[PDB]
Amino acid sequence: ATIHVDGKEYEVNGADNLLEACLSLGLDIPYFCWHPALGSVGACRQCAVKQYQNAEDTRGRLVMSCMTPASDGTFISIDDEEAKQFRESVVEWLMTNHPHDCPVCEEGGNCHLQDMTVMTGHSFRRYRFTKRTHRNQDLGPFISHEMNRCIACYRCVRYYKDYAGGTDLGVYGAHDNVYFGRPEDGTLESEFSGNLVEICPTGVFTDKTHSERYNRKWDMQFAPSICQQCSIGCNISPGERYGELRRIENRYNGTVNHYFLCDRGRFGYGYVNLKDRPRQPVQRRGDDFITLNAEQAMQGAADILRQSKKVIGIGSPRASVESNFALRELVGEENFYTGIAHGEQERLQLALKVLREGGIYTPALREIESYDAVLVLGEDVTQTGARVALAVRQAVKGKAREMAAAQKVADWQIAAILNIGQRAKHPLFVTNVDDTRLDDIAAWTYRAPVEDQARLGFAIAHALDNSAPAVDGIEPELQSKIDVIVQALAGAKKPLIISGTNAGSLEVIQAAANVAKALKGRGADVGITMIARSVNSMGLGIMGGGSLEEALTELETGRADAVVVLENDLHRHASATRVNAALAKAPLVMVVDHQRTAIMENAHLVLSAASFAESDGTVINNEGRAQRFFQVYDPAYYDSKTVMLESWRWLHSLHSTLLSREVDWTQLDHVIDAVVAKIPELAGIKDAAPDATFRIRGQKLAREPHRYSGRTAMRANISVHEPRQPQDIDTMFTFSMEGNNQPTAHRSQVPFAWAPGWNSPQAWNKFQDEVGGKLRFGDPGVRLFETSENGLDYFTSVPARFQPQDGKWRIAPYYHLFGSDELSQRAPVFQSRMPQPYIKLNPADAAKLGVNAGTRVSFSYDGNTVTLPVEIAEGLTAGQVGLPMGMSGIAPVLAGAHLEDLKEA
Amino acid sequence: TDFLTEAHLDLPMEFESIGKAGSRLGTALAMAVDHEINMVSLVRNLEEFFARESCGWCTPCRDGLPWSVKILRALERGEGQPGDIETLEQLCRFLGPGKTFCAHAPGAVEPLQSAIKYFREEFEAGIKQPFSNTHLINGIQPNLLK
Amino acid sequence: EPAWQTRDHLDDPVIGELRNRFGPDAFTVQATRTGVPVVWIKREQLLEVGDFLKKLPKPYVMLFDLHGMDERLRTHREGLPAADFSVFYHLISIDRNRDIMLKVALAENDLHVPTFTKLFPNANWYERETWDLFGITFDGHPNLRRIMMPQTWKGHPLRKDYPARATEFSPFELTKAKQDLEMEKPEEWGMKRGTENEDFMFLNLGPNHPSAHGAFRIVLQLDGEEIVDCVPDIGYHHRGAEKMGERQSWHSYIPYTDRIEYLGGCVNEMPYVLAVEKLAGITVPDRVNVIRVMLSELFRINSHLLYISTFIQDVGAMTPVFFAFTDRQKIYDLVEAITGFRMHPAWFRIGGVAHDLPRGWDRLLREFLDWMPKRLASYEKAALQNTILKGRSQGVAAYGAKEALEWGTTGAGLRATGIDFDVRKARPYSGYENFDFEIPVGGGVSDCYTRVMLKVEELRQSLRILEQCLNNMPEGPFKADHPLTTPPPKERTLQHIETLITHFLQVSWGPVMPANESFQMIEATKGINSYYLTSDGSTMSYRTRIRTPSYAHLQQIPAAIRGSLVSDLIVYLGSIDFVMSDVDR
Ligand code: SF4
Ligand code: SF4
Ligand code: SF4
Ligand code: SF4
Numbered sequence A: 001a002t003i004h005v006d007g008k009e010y011e012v013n014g015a016d017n018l019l020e021a022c023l024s025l026g027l028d029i030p031y032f033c034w035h036p037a038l039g040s041v042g043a044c045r046q047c048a049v050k051q052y053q054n055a056e057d058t059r060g061r062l063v064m065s066c067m068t069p070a071s072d073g074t075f076i077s078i079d080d081e082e083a084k085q086f087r088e089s090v091v092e093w094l095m096t097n098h099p100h101d102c103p104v105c106e107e108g109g110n111c112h113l114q115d116m117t118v119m120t121g122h123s124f125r126r127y128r129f130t131k132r133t134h135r136n137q138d139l140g141p142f143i144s145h146e147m148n149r150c151i152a153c154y155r156c157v158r159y160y161k162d163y164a165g166g167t168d169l170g171v172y173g174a175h176d177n178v179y180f181g182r183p184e185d186g187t188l189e190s191e192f193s194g195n196l197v198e199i200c201p202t203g204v205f206t207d208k209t210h211s212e213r214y215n216r217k218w219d220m221q222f223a224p225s226i227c228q229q230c231s232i233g234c235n236i237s238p239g240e241r242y243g244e245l246r247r248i249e250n251r252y253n254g255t256v257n258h259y260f261l262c263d264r265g266r267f268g269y270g271y272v273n274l275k276d277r278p279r280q281p282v283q284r285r286g287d288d289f290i291t292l293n294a295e296q297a298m299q300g301a302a303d304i305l306r307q308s309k310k311v312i313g314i315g316s317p318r319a320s321v322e323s324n325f326a327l328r329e330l331v332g333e334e335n336f337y338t339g340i341a342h343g344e345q346e347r348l349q350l351a352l353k354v355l356r357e358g359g360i361y362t363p364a365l366r367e368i369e370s371y372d373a374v375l376v377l378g379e380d381v382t383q384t385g386a387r388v389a390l391a392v393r394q395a396v397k398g399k400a401r402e403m404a405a406a407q408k409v410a411d412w413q414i415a416a417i418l419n420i421g422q423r424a425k426h427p428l429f430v431t432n433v434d435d436t437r438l439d440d441i442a443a444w445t446y447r448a449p450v451e452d453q454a455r456l457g458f459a460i461a462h463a464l465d466n467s468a469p470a471v472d473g474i475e476p477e478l479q480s481k482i483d484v485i486v487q488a489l490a491g492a493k494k495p496l497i498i499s500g501t502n503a504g505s506l507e508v509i510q511a512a513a514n515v516a517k518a519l520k521g522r523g524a525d526v527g528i529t530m531i532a533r534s535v536n537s538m539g540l541g542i543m544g545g546g547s548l549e550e551a552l553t554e555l556e557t558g559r560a561d562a563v564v565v566l567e568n569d570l571h572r573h574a575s576a577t578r579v580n581a582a583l584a585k586a587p588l589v590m591v592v593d594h595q596r597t598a599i600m601e602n603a604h605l606v607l608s609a610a611s612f613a614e615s616d617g618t619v620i621n622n623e624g625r626a627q628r629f630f631q632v633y634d635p636a637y638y639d640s641k642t643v644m645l646e647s648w649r650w651l652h653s654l655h656s657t658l659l660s661r662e663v664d665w666t667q668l669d670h671v672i673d674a675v676v677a678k679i680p681e682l683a684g685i686k687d688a689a690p691d692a693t694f695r696i697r698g699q700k701l702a703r704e705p706h707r708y709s710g711r712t713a714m715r716a717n718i719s720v721h722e723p724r725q726p727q728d729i730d731t732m733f734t735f736s737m738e739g740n741n742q743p744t745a746h747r748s749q750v751p752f753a754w755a756p757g758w759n760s761p762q763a764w765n766k767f768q769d770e771v772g773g774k775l776r777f778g779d780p781g782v783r784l785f786e787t788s789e790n791g792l793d794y795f796t797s798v799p800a801r802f803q804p805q806d807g808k809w810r811i812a813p814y815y816h817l818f819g820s821d822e823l824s825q826r827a828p829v830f831q832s833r834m835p836q837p838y839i840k841l842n843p844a845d846a847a848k849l850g851v852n853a854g855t856r857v858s859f860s861y862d863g864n865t866v867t868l869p870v871e872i873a874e875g876l877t878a879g880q881v882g883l884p885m886g887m888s889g890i891a892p893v894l895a896g897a898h899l900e901d902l903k904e905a
Numbered sequence B: 001t002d003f004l005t006e007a008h009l010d011l012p013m014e015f016e017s018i019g020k021a022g023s024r025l026g027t028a029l030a031m032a033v034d035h036e037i038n039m040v041s042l043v044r045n046l047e048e049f050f051a052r053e054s055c056g057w058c059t060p061c062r063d064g065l066p067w068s069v070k071i072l073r074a075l076e077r078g079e080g081q082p083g084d085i086e087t088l089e090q091l092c093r094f095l096g097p098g099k100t101f102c103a104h105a106p107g108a109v110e111p112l113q114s115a116i117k118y119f120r121e122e123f124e125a126g127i128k129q130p131f132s133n134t135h136l137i138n139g140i141q142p143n144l145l146k
Numbered sequence C: 001e002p003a004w005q006t007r008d009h010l011d012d013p014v015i016g017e018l019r020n021r022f023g024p025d026a027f028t029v030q031a032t033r034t035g036v037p038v039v040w041i042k043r044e045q046l047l048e049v050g051d052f053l054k055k056l057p058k059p060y061v062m063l064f065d066l067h068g069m070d071e072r073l074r075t076h077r078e079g080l081p082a083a084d085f086s087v088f089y090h091l092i093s094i095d096r097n098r099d100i101m102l103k104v105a106l107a108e109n110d111l112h113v114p115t116f117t118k119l120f121p122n123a124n125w126y127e128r129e130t131w132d133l134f135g136i137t138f139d140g141h142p143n144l145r146r147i148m149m150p151q152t153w154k155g156h157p158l159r160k161d162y163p164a165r166a167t168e169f170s171p172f173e174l175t176k177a178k179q180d181l182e183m184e185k186p187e188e189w190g191m192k193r194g195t196e197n198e199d200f201m202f203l204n205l206g207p208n209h210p211s212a213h214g215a216f217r218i219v220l221q222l223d224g225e226e227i228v229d230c231v232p233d234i235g236y237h238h239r240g241a242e243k244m245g246e247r248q249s250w251h252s253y254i255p256y257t258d259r260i261e262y263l264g265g266c267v268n269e270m271p272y273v274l275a276v277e278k279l280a281g282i283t284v285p286d287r288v289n290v291i292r293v294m295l296s297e298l299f300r301i302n303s304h305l306l307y308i309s310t311f312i313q314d315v316g317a318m319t320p321v322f323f324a325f326t327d328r329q330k331i332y333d334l335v336e337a338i339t340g341f342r343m344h345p346a347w348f349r350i351g352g353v354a355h356d357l358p359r360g361w362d363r364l365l366r367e368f369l370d371w372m373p374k375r376l377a378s379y380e381k382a383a384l385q386n387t388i389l390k391g392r393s394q395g396v397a398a399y400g401a402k403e404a405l406e407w408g409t410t411g412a413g414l415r416a417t418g419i420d421f422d423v424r425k426a427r428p429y430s431g432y433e434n435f436d437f438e439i440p441v442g443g444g445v446s447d448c449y450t451r452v453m454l455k456v457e458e459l460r461q462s463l464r465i466l467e468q469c470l471n472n473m474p475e476g477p478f479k480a481d482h483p484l485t486t487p488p489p490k491e492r493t494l495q496h497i498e499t500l501i502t503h504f505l506q507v508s509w510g511p512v513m514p515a516n517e518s519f520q521m522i523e524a525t526k527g528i529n530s531y532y533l534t535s536d537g538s539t540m541s542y543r544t545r546i547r548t549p550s551y552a553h554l555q556q557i558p559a560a561i562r563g564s565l566v567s568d569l570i571v572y573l574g575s576i577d578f579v580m581s582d583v584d585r
């Protein structure tokens, strides 16, 4: 199209509204109620521009730019006096009841309302009457509530209800007494309640975890990183102050996690600030855990490895590509073992084979929202890959969007979208051992054991295409439901099959692969998504290695007398007794870790590794996209005796000391080159981010904002002499003010969004090419593998029915967003949000044992009896028993396994 | 709807006839205000009804009708200050058809602008004290604006 | 029309003359808020344009400024030629009372500009500073070496890709530079005749000095007592003020403007806040102008008292320094009452001053106005009419109007030559039109004694301005009614949410100046001071250029001292009224 803004010609998209078209061009228009993801409602009355009918018009007409489409030849004015007077008046009306709270408000310096008050030029108050006040509700441990600061812009209710699909946040009252919150006191039950701290333009919803140890946005040292709490790999901005990780802000990625994270990845960062973490290397001599610096620890470790007959290495899916590869070089690729069990590794390798050899295009997380039918097989998406569940909700509302678009309604008229789309929505068929959080919008939910879920998928694949292996033993009404699912998937333009490794069944993955292949063979634009468990599970699968059982047999037989455990607690993937016995038999245990685990008591040496906040590296997400995360802060800047190095740095210097008897603290780009030389299937991680020589017109990228304060006084209590600015030889970033964070800088790794006049999270509008689109100069991250030309073949191994045998109980995994990822359970703010460990039972099974709800029953697995209180699950099937995966004592490896001696305590 | 005077009484009740008369036909159920009822209290009650019964969706009506209500409350008690009638005109100009989300607020401030246009002398009688928005802070010299 | 409006100055006669001479497509006129016509000239035509402006019927006789600009990080460059770097030349025509700003665009690979020293001889130090801080090489320069940093310095500090903060102190660098000092060849400095007459004695006059003007070094070559050649080595007072201007906000840079000429104070604050108000669109009220003029005149009297006392001490009389410092203590009592600080008050603000005047300032001003003139007459009769002082001063280091124009000499040295050019009259700023004061001028020779007597007369006129200000007091605000007045008035901040929001964002992120270019030129205590500010639309200055007169005066030091004595050199240094912070900044 063509618009005339103050006489200047501009070329914009004709389908866009005028506010987003003018914001894409860099023009500044105040706005509150419009969000790029939530659509438009036109409440705040802030985006007024004067539109003219033709080229020569004097009076014009004041119009709302978030309702006005950017049609061809549209003449508007922004800076003329009438529009500025109206926008200043609207800001003034918002400022009548606003509390005098900016010094004691967590949004100060990060406030959209402050930015728009300053931008409109309104600074003189002529209101002398009283201001309305509101009582503050309790929203739980994550979100702090303060309703005095609200401007009634309706963004919270729009996001939480329409977008996030929540049910316990609403607007109450009329006129100026509108109240936004829950009907009563309680925790916000949505898994994406944390995004309200960025959706809300004011300080109504604030980060309570940040509020405990609060600092302003200009004082925060930011870095671009990847969230380490599940396999989705949402881009984040961890920001620190005074040596502790303070906040996790959302980092815009137009491909993955544009405006939204989940609650686990926003509030589960508290394990970094734990005081029991190893900070210096520790050697156990006799029973004395003495403390070394880096050099003597490396020398002694290299010696004690040098007179050992065989050294094995147990990596982890928590660790990065570089650290696992450095361990692989240290011990040799024959003696390198992945830290996961055999069944988990089999499921992970099958998921990788489906992704990179199945011939079906795996979609990006932003691209999930543009699919017409979703079949989720076996994966509890909301509890394991929650952001994928949010994107699935968007794809389900896509039917209402399409129905509105068929009747001359644009995509930003979300009110008309919901008016036309009353209750019609895209088909969603979720399958699990119990009820999920997607069942409120799902067209069908199938509660069945994982064998029966796999059989459902196999029957769907056979009904879609007769070349798939058939299933015998389908009940007729279940067959009618298969026909309904097949009719929904066949009529869809873009179907999407979502599975993963969390179900604990290979056959569900095989069934999802066969459904995707059958839909591909009909000519549909089918996509397949696979949810892995940990942050770098796909990278560990691509790198490969032996399973944990092989390493345990090597330690127990005596062929290996030296074990190097990299960032693995070893109890989540194997039984505790076997791991403890194997590590007790081994005369040399060396744990390279950043979290105090149970295996460090048996460890002979502990290398204090760094977490994601104090290290760089590359992680591969569930879609196969390599993503680089950078160090946020130097740990030794505040505590000089802290020796907390990168895991790959520790292992590379250990290998160098073992070989040539000197320490070699390498550079990250050297390890990247070693990975892309030794491992050609990981050769794409070089393009994930540019190397340390990357500059923007000669200068590096600044970690901290321009107004970083206190630099001559933040360490003055230790010494009045200012220390060294920490030098970053690994990355293109600097630990200082002196860098570049321009929105027009030719770069993709943006540490934080800030623009002059835009201090809120709305500065991402300045950092994007067009608002709500991609990051300018491309989104960061690169896919490792392309879609294969030829696919796989149909998996003929159709599993049998689940037969409940007496005395044996099938463990059904019940994942929790707060409690399954180990590092998140380490966080102290998650210990109040997580539920108490309850064992889930069928009513028929509870009647058979004669136990009621809440009774403590004991069960013995691997020779250890543990007691749990019983919760009655109606959606479970008979012969199964529900257990919470990931909690203390209940490893996620227990999923899909039998359980013995289920009796009342 | 807008208030009208005795000069507008000799005018037929149609749609277009009241269209250029500066008012609306409405429901054609008129109400007469005599000399005993002061227009300040009447406009205060009208705006109080239109503010407590507004829907509160969009910013200008929701956050400006209470401002006009408080201004009229001050003018009732004689606590008006210089900068109140101009505030009423600015609010009415910024509350026109399409300036708000719907037409409830233009109908809300039609009586306000009508009583301003025809009975401005009854509203200026409520302005008695000078404009004092700030209070003196001991230790800080105020900026004497001119 | 506001005085801060963005103008292109296409109606200026110089633009029409350039169009008629070089053609309508030889240059690009930029619309700025500097108040001067800014013309982008091609690099090859720079010398031709300089000669054409030098040979006009009313020529541009003074090169006011010459420096560089790193344009790589500048985003808002609409209507501008493509430049990674640029070199700007500010030229002044006194006869027209006009000035032009030529700008030469460059590229990152070819940073080679023709030298300007053949047209204006005072371009030598400016081009040495531009090469030192920006790496821009000037072809044809006679001696293009570093002037602010040591010769063994890696990098050019004013480039955008240079780390502004201090690097770590190392004792090895200290020992290496001490070795350089101990083993510190009269050929690398441009000197000739390395003791060819068997009497060419070499001495070092600095760098440490028993004087308040600062620290700097001159290497003197003498035939007996006669100076034959002198190479001044400056940069012993470099503080990175412009690099700090790129590192502080628009509001938190005012203390750094205070220490540019540390005897000036509010006089140094004045052009910076006026230029930021040009960038912000702020027209301050008349009471603000009156207050700022009062404090500028008080600090001018303070600086002139220090200069006269220092000159009299340099000649040899040691009592008037004690008496003039007692008078300076009276001025400091008044300034302490008004602002709360003696020498660096940091009191001017964007859009006004920090606080209102305290209740009782007029009593101290009346005390000082009664105290001062009798002491001034005592100073004159006791030392300034002494014939020994006159013999030490008169006819020593003299120059005419041509030498003052060709070296960019401004202030008392310029007006001692008969050139009646004062900024407070020629280009009146901050309400100086409302005060009745005279401009003292010389007879045509700028001696040491003539400059000292002109500074005495300037002190008398500043006292007259203070009397006229004390008699007539306007009443009103001490801060402007603009949304960009930084900070807002304090009581409204303490009890109004809009004012609190504006204060919160202005004192933390900074005020956002829209992307423009501003320039303010004022009459400093020591000459003509100027702030040239480029905003990229951010809360910090994209470029801060400070032109100081002491730079030009120290560049004129070798031109007027050849063939004189060392005592004449000491008297000349004492009679310039310079400080080393002004030169090096
Ligand atoms: S929400 Fe914004 S405007 Fe309101 S008190 Fe907080 S920082 Fe100030
Ligand atoms: S609570 Fe926040 S997001 Fe919700 S209406 Fe109020 S200002 Fe808007
Ligand atoms: S969905 Fe996974 S990767 Fe994304 S924020 Fe949540 S825990 Fe982190
Ligand atoms: S003008 Fe209408 S939509 Fe707006 S708040 Fe008032 S009653 Fe509601």
Ligand code: FES
Residues within 6 Å of the ligand: A019, A030, A031, A032, A033, A034, A041, A042, A043, A044, A045, A046, A047, A064, A065, A066, A067
């Ligand atoms: S952004 Fe358009 S009215 Fe709210």
Ligand SMILES: [Ca+2]
Residues within 6 Å of the ligand: A614, A615, A616, A631, A646, A730
């Ligand atoms: Ca690092």
